[PDB]
Amino acid sequence: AKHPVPKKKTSKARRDARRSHHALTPPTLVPCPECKAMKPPHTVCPECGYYAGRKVLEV
Amino acid sequence: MFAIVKTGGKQYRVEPGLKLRVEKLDAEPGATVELPVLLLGGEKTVVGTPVVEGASVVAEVLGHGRGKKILVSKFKAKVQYRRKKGHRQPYTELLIKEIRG
Amino acid sequence: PRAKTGVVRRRKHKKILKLAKGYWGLRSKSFRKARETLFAAGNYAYAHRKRRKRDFRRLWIVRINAACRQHGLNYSTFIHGLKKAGIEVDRKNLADLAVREPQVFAELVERAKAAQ
Amino acid sequence: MKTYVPKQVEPRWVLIDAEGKTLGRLATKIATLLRGKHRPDWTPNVAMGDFVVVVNADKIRVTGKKLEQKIYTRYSGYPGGLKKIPLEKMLATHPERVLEHAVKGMLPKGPLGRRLFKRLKVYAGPDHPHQAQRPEKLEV
Amino acid sequence: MEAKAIARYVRISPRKVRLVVDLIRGKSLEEARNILRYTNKRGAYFVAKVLESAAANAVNNHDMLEDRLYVKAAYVDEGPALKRVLPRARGRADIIKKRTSHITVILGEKHG
Amino acid sequence: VAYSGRKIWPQKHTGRARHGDIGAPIFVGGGVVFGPKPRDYSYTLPKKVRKKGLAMAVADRAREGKLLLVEAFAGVNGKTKEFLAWAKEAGLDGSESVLLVTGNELVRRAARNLPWVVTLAPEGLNVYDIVRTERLVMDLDAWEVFQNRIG
RNA sequence: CGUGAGGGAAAGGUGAAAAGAACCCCGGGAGGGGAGUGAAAUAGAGCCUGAAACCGUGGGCUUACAAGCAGUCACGGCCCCGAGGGGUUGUGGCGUGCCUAUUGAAGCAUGAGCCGGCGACUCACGGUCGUGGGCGAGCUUAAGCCGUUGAGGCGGAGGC
RNA sequence: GUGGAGCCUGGGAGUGAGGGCGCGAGCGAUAACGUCCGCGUCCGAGCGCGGGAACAACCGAGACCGCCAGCUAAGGCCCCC
RNA sequence: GGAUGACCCCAGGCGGUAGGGGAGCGUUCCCGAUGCCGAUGAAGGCCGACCCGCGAGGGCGGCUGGAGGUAAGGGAAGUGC
Ligand SMILES: [Mg+2]
Ligand SMILES: [Mg+2]
Ligand SMILES: [Mg+2]
Ligand SMILES: [Mg+2]
Ligand SMILES: [Mg+2]
Ligand SMILES: [Mg+2]
Ligand SMILES: [Mg+2]
Ligand SMILES: [Mg+2]
Ligand SMILES: [Mg+2]
Ligand SMILES: [Mg+2]
Ligand SMILES: [Mg+2]
Ligand SMILES: [Mg+2]
Ligand SMILES: [Mg+2]
Ligand SMILES: [Mg+2]
Ligand SMILES: [Mg+2]
Ligand SMILES: [Mg+2]
Ligand SMILES: [Mg+2]
Ligand SMILES: [Mg+2]
Ligand SMILES: [Mg+2]
Ligand SMILES: [Mg+2]
Ligand SMILES: [Mg+2]
Ligand SMILES: [Mg+2]
Ligand SMILES: [Mg+2]
Ligand SMILES: [Mg+2]
Ligand SMILES: [Mg+2]
Ligand SMILES: [Mg+2]
Ligand SMILES: [Mg+2]
Ligand SMILES: [Mg+2]
Ligand SMILES: [Mg+2]
Ligand SMILES: [Mg+2]
Ligand SMILES: [Mg+2]
Ligand SMILES: [Mg+2]
Ligand SMILES: [Mg+2]
Ligand SMILES: [Mg+2]
Ligand SMILES: [Mg+2]
Ligand SMILES: [Mg+2]
Ligand SMILES: [Mg+2]
Ligand SMILES: [Mg+2]
Ligand SMILES: [Mg+2]
Ligand SMILES: [Mg+2]
Ligand SMILES: [Mg+2]
Ligand SMILES: [Mg+2]
Ligand SMILES: [Mg+2]
Ligand SMILES: [Mg+2]
Ligand SMILES: [Mg+2]
Ligand SMILES: [Mg+2]
Ligand SMILES: [Mg+2]
Ligand SMILES: [Mg+2]
Ligand SMILES: [Mg+2]
Ligand SMILES: [Mg+2]
Ligand SMILES: [Mg+2]
Ligand SMILES: [Mg+2]
Ligand SMILES: [Mg+2]
Ligand SMILES: [Mg+2]
Ligand SMILES: [Mg+2]
Ligand SMILES: [Mg+2]
Ligand SMILES: [Mg+2]
Ligand SMILES: [Mg+2]
Ligand SMILES: [Mg+2]
Ligand SMILES: [Mg+2]
Ligand SMILES: [Mg+2]
Ligand SMILES: [Mg+2]
Ligand SMILES: [Mg+2]
Ligand SMILES: [Mg+2]
Ligand SMILES: [Mg+2]
Ligand SMILES: [Mg+2]
Ligand SMILES: [Mg+2]
Ligand SMILES: [Mg+2]
Ligand SMILES: [Mg+2]
Ligand SMILES: [Mg+2]
Ligand SMILES: [Mg+2]
Ligand SMILES: [Mg+2]
Ligand SMILES: [Mg+2]
Ligand SMILES: [Mg+2]
Ligand SMILES: [Mg+2]
Ligand SMILES: [Mg+2]
Ligand SMILES: [Mg+2]
Ligand SMILES: [Mg+2]
Ligand SMILES: [Mg+2]
Ligand SMILES: [Mg+2]
Ligand SMILES: [Mg+2]
Ligand SMILES: [Mg+2]
Ligand SMILES: [Mg+2]
Ligand SMILES: [Mg+2]
Ligand SMILES: [Mg+2]
Ligand SMILES: [Mg+2]
Ligand SMILES: [Mg+2]
Ligand SMILES: [Mg+2]
Ligand SMILES: [Mg+2]
Ligand SMILES: [Mg+2]
Ligand SMILES: [Mg+2]
Ligand SMILES: [Mg+2]
Ligand SMILES: [Mg+2]
Ligand SMILES: [Mg+2]
Ligand SMILES: [Mg+2]
Ligand SMILES: [Mg+2]
Ligand SMILES: [Mg+2]
Ligand SMILES: [Mg+2]
Ligand SMILES: [Mg+2]
Ligand SMILES: [Mg+2]
Ligand SMILES: [Mg+2]
Ligand SMILES: [Mg+2]
Ligand SMILES: [Mg+2]
Ligand SMILES: [Mg+2]
Ligand SMILES: [Mg+2]
Ligand SMILES: [Mg+2]
Ligand SMILES: [Mg+2]
Ligand SMILES: [Mg+2]
Ligand SMILES: [Mg+2]
Ligand SMILES: [Mg+2]
Ligand SMILES: [Mg+2]
Ligand SMILES: [Mg+2]
Ligand SMILES: [Mg+2]
Ligand SMILES: [Mg+2]
Ligand SMILES: [Mg+2]
Ligand SMILES: [Mg+2]
Ligand SMILES: [Mg+2]
Ligand SMILES: [Mg+2]
Ligand SMILES: [Mg+2]
Ligand SMILES: [Mg+2]
Ligand SMILES: [Mg+2]
Ligand SMILES: [Mg+2]
Ligand SMILES: [Mg+2]
Ligand SMILES: [Mg+2]
Ligand SMILES: [Mg+2]
Ligand SMILES: [Mg+2]
Ligand SMILES: [Mg+2]
Ligand SMILES: [Mg+2]
Ligand SMILES: [Mg+2]
Ligand SMILES: [Mg+2]
Ligand SMILES: [Mg+2]
Ligand SMILES: [Mg+2]
Ligand SMILES: [Mg+2]
Ligand SMILES: [Mg+2]
Ligand SMILES: [Mg+2]
Ligand SMILES: [Mg+2]
Ligand SMILES: [Mg+2]
Ligand SMILES: [Mg+2]
Ligand SMILES: [Mg+2]
Ligand SMILES: [Mg+2]
Ligand SMILES: [Mg+2]
Ligand SMILES: [Mg+2]
Ligand SMILES: [Mg+2]
Ligand SMILES: [Mg+2]
Ligand SMILES: [Mg+2]
Ligand SMILES: [Mg+2]
Ligand SMILES: [Mg+2]
Ligand SMILES: [Mg+2]
Ligand SMILES: [Mg+2]
Ligand SMILES: [Mg+2]
Ligand SMILES: [Mg+2]
Ligand SMILES: [Mg+2]
Ligand SMILES: [Mg+2]
Ligand SMILES: [Mg+2]
Ligand SMILES: [Mg+2]
Ligand SMILES: [Mg+2]
Ligand SMILES: [Mg+2]
Ligand SMILES: [Mg+2]
Ligand SMILES: [Mg+2]
Ligand SMILES: [Mg+2]
Ligand SMILES: [Mg+2]
Ligand SMILES: [Mg+2]
Ligand SMILES: [Mg+2]
Ligand SMILES: [Mg+2]
Ligand SMILES: [Mg+2]
Ligand SMILES: [Mg+2]
Ligand SMILES: [Mg+2]
Ligand SMILES: [Mg+2]
Ligand SMILES: [Mg+2]
Ligand SMILES: [Mg+2]
Ligand SMILES: [Zn+2]
């Protein structure tokens, strides 16, 4: 190897174009059928401890 | 009815009521002037050869002024030749009063 | 006494940078780049001032030519006829006539044919 | 007085019977119609020419031995990707491409001329599907 | 009426926090809280506190209603960077910049 | 400059520009190039020019009529209020700046503090002071030695 | 920093006065929001002014069939300010960075990431022309002495 | 022949790496974007402008500034143009 | 022309590297200044499509800034990146 190196400074425009994919997708959340609080689906509700209609966990 | 006149080495189509910018004329503001006619048209049509004898266009001079500054710049690379010159072209403003056919 | 740069240089740079507004990237933001662009733009203007006078005449000639061929003759014939007729109405006006006042242009075409 | 500039006008449709005509000489006229340089109000920065429909493209005629000797060419970008197709075959396979390729090279390069070539509708065989546009038959 | 809160000199790199701040701009206060709660980023903690502190000021100081609040505006500016040495091979020293953020959240009321 | 004479880094092969010592005027904190040093700005203007200048300066005032000669200074004895008396009495209300030239120390002490008055011993007469002022007022004893210098 | 001789930095400014922000609110704190001080608090101690590069937020115009030293000239669309002008750029025309070095550079030859500040034809004495004045077969003083305390004079040794 | 002509005294330089082209030679191989002289020219310093597809020195022509006026030079007039 | 750089009229010159010459602009400082501008706002900063100048620049107006600045005319340089 012979130590490759950038030929030109990346423009503000080109830098920012590269970052057109870097945006975050907001978390996917559904209401908990017991306490109405929002939570990730398929996860035991951290607010009331309910999953599949029953208490699973102390919160 | 329009007319084609010739002032300051250039030609323009004029109708009464029109305001016009031409090259500077040696005439006090407010005075009126007669411009040479190359062609009359609209109702009748007369073709100057090159000018039309009896016809003239009477214009009142509204004033004289200087055009907005243009920057004419000269640059020659690898030589340190650079020139900056500011140019405002003189002009006179006319109001076309009548077309004497 | 001492006369340090002080205020003078910033001011000279701002003159340039204001003149370079609108340009792309560092050309409107960096003094040095602004200057290099402004040099080119000065020569371009001067050159294009001179060539604008050409750009229009060629349009005028194309338009005059279009109206001439409607009456069965070409531009090169039309101009010669006008010269022989002694008509000195310019191409800026001939073109305006060709479009705005077609019957007036027709008459000129007539005198052009009559001249030869 | 500044030079007249036309606002957009309704485009005229034109029909041409290409049968028996000399390829290159018909090409120029269509280019002209496309540009709109036959209109007294011509303006170079807008699409204001005619729409040109051409029929009997396959029945275009050509002088000399070009039918065998004119080689149309296409490069794919791959090694050894230079394809040579003679005129004979081009008429035998996609005849309307002949008038098209000719007219295209006589139109200006860039965005506008590229869109002018879109105003050229060329068909081999006497029939064209633009009866809706009611094209004006031109002798050229 | 608006209410704002600014956390200055937060020891996190502006580029990282903005990613999170962008997630809640123009959202209802309730929706934003829901998002920050389940966003898997370090920045979420910081953006959260500034959001709550801004909501607090709205209810307390500025006569606004918690049930009307939304994130009208939000942005991160960059503060003074913390420069630190990072020893490299063959005796060379590099300089790491541990950056800093000024997080701003501005809250408004959605009437109806 | 105070710094050392050592070459700060080797001539070649560092990837930096070449340098000598940091006292070089190219460096910040380094010496100055062609800056000021102690200097004697005086020169010997031709005596005949100076003398001629004195005469000319007085003449110019004399021609304006701004020159006044006085025989003695009435009641002035070292008090400013006293000079103002006499000054007013002579047509000197302070609306014009006056160079007062006299050997009477007592008269100079009384008039020195006036904003509109410059004071001079007759040996000290000089064209700058004359040109600076609007009026020239002279003791006859002063006007006498003035005559001697320009003679 | 260097074993050592030795090398050798950076770093000044709230306000007239601390009157340096009691108390309350969110926060573990930091920070901030109100309250209060002040003529002024984007004078809040990370404090006069606060340029530029650089980063961001909001708004207007614009861009996903297009070939480019990035501009320039023309026309048109849109936005703004009220026969005009400002911003923007769709299409058309034209168009080989700056500097340095070279016979010749856009050059695939040198230098330069960008911005700000430092940065190079001076001074003394002598010489040689030119030039503005003074005196002119003459012109001029030097060290010193007296005077002044930003006052000028004396001094003829000497030099041309 | 009154010309940014010429001659005389003096102040100030810069240059003392040239290059293409045409014609006349030597050298080379009736080779070189070769080399060394001569007369001229242009580029150098006119990498400003029109032509030669593009191209310092080939053809045209010496750019004080402005004009949306006119005439021409070389080169051109089927379309790109 | 008028008599003198008063302004007007007619005519011709005005590509330019090394380089010679000329005229100016601006920066710090001194005399002018015991003066004058200044909290009804100094300098400096950010604007401007306005005014004067070929240009370097100089004005004027808006915002910022909050205590300095400095004319006509002359003088001297650590004087323009
Ligand atoms: Mg390897
Ligand atoms: Mg390798
Ligand atoms: Mg590698
Ligand atoms: Mg290896
Ligand atoms: Mg590598
Ligand atoms: Mg590289
Ligand atoms: Mg960047
Ligand atoms: Mg951006
Ligand atoms: Mg990229
Ligand atoms: Mg998950
Ligand atoms: Mg619980
Ligand atoms: Mg005329
Ligand atoms: Mg009208
Ligand atoms: Mg004029
Ligand atoms: Mg005009
Ligand atoms: Mg050049
Ligand atoms: Mg160039
Ligand atoms: Mg260059
Ligand atoms: Mg050169
Ligand atoms: Mg140059
Ligand atoms: Mg400085
Ligand atoms: Mg500068
Ligand atoms: Mg500066
Ligand atoms: Mg400034
Ligand atoms: Mg300036
Ligand atoms: Mg722009
Ligand atoms: Mg523009
Ligand atoms: Mg930019
Ligand atoms: Mg950009
Ligand atoms: Mg920038
Ligand atoms: Mg320029
Ligand atoms: Mg021009
Ligand atoms: Mg040109
Ligand atoms: Mg022409
Ligand atoms: Mg021309
Ligand atoms: Mg054109
Ligand atoms: Mg015909
Ligand atoms: Mg003719
Ligand atoms: Mg003609
Ligand atoms: Mg036709
Ligand atoms: Mg054929
Ligand atoms: Mg097919
Ligand atoms: Mg083209
Ligand atoms: Mg997430
Ligand atoms: Mg609350
Ligand atoms: Mg090492
Ligand atoms: Mg770095
Ligand atoms: Mg770093
Ligand atoms: Mg030392
Ligand atoms: Mg030392
Ligand atoms: Mg030493
Ligand atoms: Mg040594
Ligand atoms: Mg040493
Ligand atoms: Mg390097
Ligand atoms: Mg470096
Ligand atoms: Mg070195
Ligand atoms: Mg050194
Ligand atoms: Mg040293
Ligand atoms: Mg120091
Ligand atoms: Mg020092
Ligand atoms: Mg020092
Ligand atoms: Mg220095
Ligand atoms: Mg030195
Ligand atoms: Mg010196
Ligand atoms: Mg001394
Ligand atoms: Mg001297
Ligand atoms: Mg002396
Ligand atoms: Mg006094
Ligand atoms: Mg005193
Ligand atoms: Mg005084
Ligand atoms: Mg005094
Ligand atoms: Mg050691
Ligand atoms: Mg030690
Ligand atoms: Mg050492
Ligand atoms: Mg240092
Ligand atoms: Mg203070
Ligand atoms: Mg203090
Ligand atoms: Mg607490
Ligand atoms: Mg608490
Ligand atoms: Mg704890
Ligand atoms: Mg606190
Ligand atoms: Mg807060
Ligand atoms: Mg507080
Ligand atoms: Mg208060
Ligand atoms: Mg006040
Ligand atoms: Mg402020
Ligand atoms: Mg302040
Ligand atoms: Mg501050
Ligand atoms: Mg202060
Ligand atoms: Mg700041
Ligand atoms: Mg800034
Ligand atoms: Mg944006
Ligand atoms: Mg396509
Ligand atoms: Mg598109
Ligand atoms: Mg436009
Ligand atoms: Mg507009
Ligand atoms: Mg363009
Ligand atoms: Mg080239
Ligand atoms: Mg440059
Ligand atoms: Mg070299
Ligand atoms: Mg070389
Ligand atoms: Mg070479
Ligand atoms: Mg290149
Ligand atoms: Mg390069
Ligand atoms: Mg390159
Ligand atoms: Mg080299
Ligand atoms: Mg270089
Ligand atoms: Mg570097
Ligand atoms: Mg940059
Ligand atoms: Mg010298
Ligand atoms: Mg002399
Ligand atoms: Mg003398
Ligand atoms: Mg003597
Ligand atoms: Mg001697
Ligand atoms: Mg000459
Ligand atoms: Mg000569
Ligand atoms: Mg000579
Ligand atoms: Mg000289
Ligand atoms: Mg010299
Ligand atoms: Mg030499
Ligand atoms: Mg030699
Ligand atoms: Mg030689
Ligand atoms: Mg040689
Ligand atoms: Mg030779
Ligand atoms: Mg021949
Ligand atoms: Mg030969
Ligand atoms: Mg031979
Ligand atoms: Mg052979
Ligand atoms: Mg050769
Ligand atoms: Mg040869
Ligand atoms: Mg030969
Ligand atoms: Mg030759
Ligand atoms: Mg050379
Ligand atoms: Mg040439
Ligand atoms: Mg020449
Ligand atoms: Mg060419
Ligand atoms: Mg050429
Ligand atoms: Mg060509
Ligand atoms: Mg070209
Ligand atoms: Mg060429
Ligand atoms: Mg060649
Ligand atoms: Mg002609
Ligand atoms: Mg010819
Ligand atoms: Mg051709
Ligand atoms: Mg022919
Ligand atoms: Mg083409
Ligand atoms: Mg044509
Ligand atoms: Mg003239
Ligand atoms: Mg000329
Ligand atoms: Mg010249
Ligand atoms: Mg040279
Ligand atoms: Mg001269
Ligand atoms: Mg300056
Ligand atoms: Mg000056
Ligand atoms: Mg003073
Ligand atoms: Mg004062
Ligand atoms: Mg006052
Ligand atoms: Mg006040
Ligand atoms: Mg104010
Ligand atoms: Mg100052
Ligand atoms: Mg200004
Ligand atoms: Mg204020
Ligand atoms: Mg101000
Ligand atoms: Mg004071
Ligand atoms: Mg000042
Ligand atoms: Mg002053
Ligand atoms: Mg002055
Ligand atoms: Mg003076
Ligand atoms: Mg000095
Ligand atoms: Mg210096
Ligand atoms: Zn639940």
- The gap between the terminal CA atoms of chain A, to the nearest Å, is 57
Quick check: E30 contacting A, CB < 8 Å? Answer: no
Chain B positions touching C90 (Cβ under 8 A) are 10-11
Residue D84 forms beta bridges with which residues?
D73
Q: Please, what is the angle between helix D96-105 and helix D23-35, to 10°?
A: 60
B with C: touching (≥3 Cβ pairs within 8 Å): yes
**Nearest CA distance, C6 vs chain B (angstrom):** 25
- The resolution, in angstroms to one decimal, equals 3.1
Check the CA dihedral D118-D120-D125-D129 and report its sign.
positive
Rg (CA), chain C: 26
B89 CB-near residues (< 8 Å, 6+ apart):
B66, B67, B70
The number of C-beta contacts closer than 8 angstroms across A and C is 3
Query: Contact at 8 Å (CB) between F82 and F120?
Result: no
- Identify the H or E element spanning D13: strand D13-17
Kind of pairing between the strands at D13-17 and B46-47: unpaired
> What is the full DSSP assignment across E38-66?
T--SHHHHHHHHHHHHHHHHHHHTS---T
**Residue E34 to residues A20, C77, E48, F51: CA-CA distances in angstroms?**
25, 82, 10, 99
Instruction: Please list every residue in chain C followed by a chain break, i.e. its C lies more than 2.5 Å from the next written N.
Output: none
Tell me which chain A residue has its CA closest to the CA of residue C26.
Answer: A11
CA-CA-CA-CA dihedral for F117, F122, F123, F126, to nearest 10: 50
CA distance B51 to F43: 80
Phi and psi dihedrals of F124, rounded to 5?
A: -95, 5
What is the C-alpha to C-alpha distance for residues B100 and A10, in angstroms, rounded to an integer?
Answer: 69
Closest nucleotide (C1' vs CA) to B69 is: H66
Question: What letter would DSSP give residue D132?
Answer: G
Chain C contacts to A (CB-CB under 8 A): 25
A40/chain E closest Cα distance in angstroms = 8
Q: What single letter denotes the amino acid at residue A42?
A: H
Nearest-angstrom CA–CA distance, A3 and C64: 65
CB contact under 8 A, A27 and E35: yes
Residue from D128, D64, D72 nearest D102 by CA: D72
Amino acid type, D20? G
Whole-angstrom distance, CA of residue F110 vs CA of residue F121:
14
Q: How far apart are the first and last CA of chain D?
A: 37
CA–C1' B80–H21 (A): 29
Amino acid at E70: Y
- H-only helix segments in chain F: 47-64, 80-89, 105-111, 127-132, 140-149
Whole-number Å distance, alpha carbon F16 to ligand 108 midpoint, is 10
CB atoms within 10 A of CB D23: 19
- For residue C97, the one-letter residue type is L
Per CB-CB distance under 8 Å, the chain C contacts of D4 are 95-96, 99-100
Nucleotide nearest residue B9, measured CA to C1': H69
Q: Do chains E and A touch by CB distance (3+ pairs < 8 Å)? A: yes
Q: Which chain E residues are closer than 8 Å to A40 by Cβ?
A: 38
CA of A23 to C1' of G136 (A): 96
* Class of residue C107 by CB neighbours under 10 A (exposed 0-12, middle 13-18, buried 19+): middle
Rounded Cα–Cα distance for residues E17 and E39 (Å)? 12
On the question of a cis peptide bond just before residue D126, with omega within 30 degrees of 0, the verdict is no
Q: How close is the nearest chain A Cα to the Cα of E43, in Å?
A: 12
Which experiment gave this structure?
A: X-ray
Give the residue on C whose Cα is nearest the Cα of A11: C25
For residue F141, what are the contacts with CB-CB under 8 A and spacing of at least 6?
F102, F103, F122
How long is the CA C9 to C1' I35 vector, in angstroms? 33
The alpha carbon of E77 and the centre of ligand 29 are apart by a number of angstroms equal to 19
- Cα distance between residue B43 and residue A22, in whole Å: 71
Neighbours of E21 (CB within 10 A): 25
Per DSSP, D12 falls in state P
B68 contacts B88 by C-beta, under 8 angstroms: yes
What is the C-alpha to C-alpha distance for residues C66 and C98, in angstroms, rounded to an integer?
9
Residue E42, chain A, CB below 8 Å: the answer is: no
Q: Is the CB of B77 under 7 A from strand H?
A: yes
